[PDB]
Swiss-Prot record, chain A:
SUPFAM superfamilies in the cross-refs: Nucleic acid-binding proteins
Transmembrane segments: none
Cross-link (Glycyl lysine isopeptide (Lys-Gly) (interchain with G-Cter in ubiquitin)): K55
UniProt record, GO biological process: maintenance of translational fidelity; maturation of SSU-rRNA from tricistronic rRNA transcript (SSU-rRNA, 5.8S rRNA, LSU-rRNA); regulation of translational fidelity; translation
InterPro entries documented for this protein: NA-bd_OB-fold, Ribosomal_uS12, Ribosomal_uS12_euk/arc
Outcome after substituting N64A: Lethal mutation
Protein name: Small ribosomal subunit protein uS12A
One GO cellular component term: cytosolic small ribosomal subunit
UniProtKB/Swiss-Prot annotation, chain B:
Main function: GTPase required for synthesis of 40S ribosomal subunits and for processing the 35S pre-rRNA at sites A0, A1, and A2. Controls access of pre-ribosomal RNA intermediates to RCL1 during ribosome biogenesis by binding of RCL1 in a GTP-dependent manner and, via its affinity to U3 snoRNA, delivering it to pre-ribosomes. GTP-binding and/or GTP hydrolysis may induce conformational rearrangements within the BMS1-RCL1 complex allowing the interaction of RCL1 with its RNA substrate. Required for RCL1 import into the nucleus.
Source organism: Saccharomyces cerevisiae (strain ATCC 204508 / S288c) (Baker's yeast)
Chain spans, region Disordered: 1-38
Residue stretches of biased makeup (Basic residues): 1-22
Residues of the full protein shown: 2 to 50 of 1183
Family membership noted in the UniProt record: Belongs to the TRAFAC class translation factor GTPase superfamily. Bms1-like GTPase family. BMS1 subfamily.
Subunit structure: Interacts directly with RCL1 and the U3 snoRNA to form a stable subcomplex. Component of the 90S small subunit processome also known as 90S pre-ribosome that consists of the 35S pre-rRNA, early-associating ribosomal proteins most of which are part of the small ribosomal subunit, the U3 snoRNA and associated proteins.
UniProt subcellular location: Cytoplasm; Nucleus, Nucleolus
Protein name per its UniProtKB record: Ribosome biogenesis protein BMS1
Length: 143, 49
RNA sequence: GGAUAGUGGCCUACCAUGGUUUCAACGGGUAACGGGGAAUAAGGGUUCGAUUCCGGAGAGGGAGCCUGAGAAACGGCUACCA
RNA sequence: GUGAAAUUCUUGGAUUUAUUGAAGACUAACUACUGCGAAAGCAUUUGCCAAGGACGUUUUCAUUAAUCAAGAACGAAAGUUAGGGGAUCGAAGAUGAUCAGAUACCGUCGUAGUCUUAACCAUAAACUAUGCCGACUAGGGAUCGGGUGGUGUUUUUUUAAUGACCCACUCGGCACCUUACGAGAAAUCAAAGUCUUUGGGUUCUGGGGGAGUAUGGUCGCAAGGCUGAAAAAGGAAUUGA
């Protein structure tokens, strides 16, 4: 008879059994304990904040290669160094040194011809203004 | 030649239940009363920090 | 018996030794004010409801009182911590 | 005694032979796809003590039932404690031979054990690699226990048994052979089935392999604390110069 009780008074058993097994689930346990965001890429947040340490690939030759677009920033709520993209070597110029960049996830959908893997972050705001804003010449980077 | 099939013996630790109770306190008990609200407030608070 | 607007271990005497509990009491947690309602799924359910109305509680934190039909009030008072 | 040997024991006669005696285990052939039991398990004879299934029943009570945590009973072999006995085999150990080949890695002796009583231990590939109770859903023979019937042989007849075989029927078993209008990825399954997507009752349980890594997730386990050495044809050679 399918393993579970079925009698019209057995609701206490059906309910209590469900509670224990619901705990045995995994998304559920994490949701109630508060750990999904300890799994998340960089903590709770959706953007993180970092300091530009050094620009990698300054000396590479072919322009607009991934190792040109990359930089290296240390996340400030950990003191933890991670590398990050930046479109447009021009924008590589817009970001220089000790700049307080605002990083976001990369969320790439498909690989490219020479994309560096294992580089999951992209720079969004630099010293408080938008990289696309600077690049489009709407704004100007305030020192 | 002979093909002597082997047999598995028994499990060691693959249980969500014992994994919950394996730390001293009952991680099941020390929980909250509104998981969705926790989620969105932790979101918002982490961003503000 | 005292007290109260008045019921009542409410409190005080003097008596009995009871009361709740696997139908989960007691304890711990709660990013818990409760409900009308909001979102959404075909149903079953699930999650949200600090937030326009209803109720409760609070006016930095303990406690205490005066007036008055109505306050343990804080745009009233008294002392204590901050 | 081995493949080959060897320690060993043998003029106080061994191995062998005859007649006996003691000691402790053990119960051969008969032994089967047969029996019994809750499983582990259980084979010589007779006796006693209780117990059990099945079958037969025109006996009796009248729902007393099923599933079930806690706990309890028992639980092969090995093992532990204390006694007893101690023939046999025999972890450790002591020894022989280390002979090529392990194709043919053993021999002699033997503590503990094996056996027994009284306690512990509670584990096995403890297997039919599959929780239990109930019901229905395919044919076929054989076989073990009981009962009913039939028929002739085997039997025997006023004494104490009146059992064997054959045949049909029959409940209940150990299994088997064919197949599934079913199920399944397949092997297979009479349950692992019960007409397309699902309710006969009930308990427990669930949300691969190697690798590579981080460890504050945690538990174990270590040392010393007077102590030190300085390049070669300046070859090969019964094969050379």
């Amino acid at each position: 008879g399918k393993g579970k009780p079925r009698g019209l008074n057995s609701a206490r058993k059906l309910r209590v059994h469900r509670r224990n097994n619901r705990w045995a689930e995994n998304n559920y346990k994490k949701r109630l304990l508060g750990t999904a965001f300890k799994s998340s890429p960089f903590g709770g947040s959706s953007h993180a904040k970092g300091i530009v340490l050094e620009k990698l690939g300054i000396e590479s030759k072919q322009p607009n290669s991934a190792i040109r677009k990359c930089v290296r920033v240390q996340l400030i709520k950990n003191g933890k160094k991670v590398t990050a993209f930046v479109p447009n070597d021009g924008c590589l110029n817009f970001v220089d040194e000790n700049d307080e960049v605002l990083l976001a996830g990369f969320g790439r959908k498909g690989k490219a011809k020479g994309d560096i893997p294992g580089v999951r972050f992209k720079v969004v705001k630099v010293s408080g203004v938008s990289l696309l804003a600077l690049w489009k010449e709407k704004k100007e980077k305030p020192r | 030649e002979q093909s002597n099939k082997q047999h598995r013996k028994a499990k060691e630790k693959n249980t969500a239940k014992k994994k919950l109770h394996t730390q001293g306190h009952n991680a099941k008990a020390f929980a909250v009363a509104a998981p969705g609200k926790m989620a969105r407030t932790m979101q918002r608070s982490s961003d503000v920090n």
